[PDB]
Amino acid sequence: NQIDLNVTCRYAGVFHVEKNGRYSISRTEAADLCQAFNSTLPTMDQMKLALSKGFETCRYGFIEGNVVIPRIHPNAICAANHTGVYILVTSNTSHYDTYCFNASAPPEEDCTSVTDLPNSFDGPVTITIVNRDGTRYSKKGEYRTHQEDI
Ligand SMILES: Cc1ncsc1C(=O)N(C)[C@@H](C)C1CC1
């Protein structure tokens, strides 16, 4: 019973979380997941400031109100070569990665590793935070509050 959470650097408190190496998070699960990191879904303004500090990914993820990809450099296979916060307009499907916002993070680029999941609750799942540099933090718990996400 295991969940891998791949996380990034934080940029003005914003970071990306990919679950089990595939698009697999619902909007309800995304809010609960960010809550386990003492974080919330970023607002579009928070995401734009993170972008301006150096944040970009090549994955769709939830923010408040939309599913987006922050882009700095044009890349043909990432958001159809767009720059800025690219907003997903048309999709049949509901599951993506998520972005999260931690207000107590440093103001600009923070590429230190994440070493805790401070606000998960009691549960049976082995949750493993996986950093980009491979370092890991694991703990037994749960973060999903909606049964349909389990
Ligand atoms: C534990 C941790 N490791 C690096 S920063 C940091 C922290 O204070 N957080 C609140 C983390 C859990 C959020 C991912 C930003």
Curated annotation (Swiss-Prot):
Disulfide-bond pairs as recorded: 9-111, 34-100, 58-78
PTM comment, free text: N-glycosylated.
Record domain Link: where: 13-102
Binding site for hyaluronan: 22, 59-60, 86
Tissue specificity as recorded in UniProt: Expressed in the intestinal epithelium.
Glycosylation site list: 6, 38, 81, 92, 102
Subcellular localization(s) per the UniProt record: Cell membrane; Cell projection, Microvillus; Secreted
Assembly description: Interacts with PKN2. Interacts with TIAM1 and TIAM2. Interacts with HA, as well as other glycosaminoglycans, collagen, laminin, and fibronectin via its N-terminal segment. Interacts with UNC119. Interacts with PDPN (via extracellular domain); this interaction is required for PDPN-mediated directional migration and regulation of lamellipodia extension/stabilization during cell spreading and migration. Interacts with RDX, EZR and MSN (via FERM domain). Interacts with EGFR. Interacts with CD74; this complex is essential for the MIF-induced signaling cascade that results in B cell survival.
Role, per record: Cell-surface receptor that plays a role in cell-cell interactions, cell adhesion and migration, helping them to sense and respond to changes in the tissue microenvironment. Participates thereby in a wide variety of cellular functions including the activation, recirculation and homing of T-lymphocytes, hematopoiesis, inflammation and response to bacterial infection.
Comment block on domains: The lectin-like LINK domain is responsible for hyaluronan binding.
Name the record gives this protein: CD44 antigen
Organism: Mus musculus (Mouse)
Portion of the full sequence shown: 23 to 171 of 778
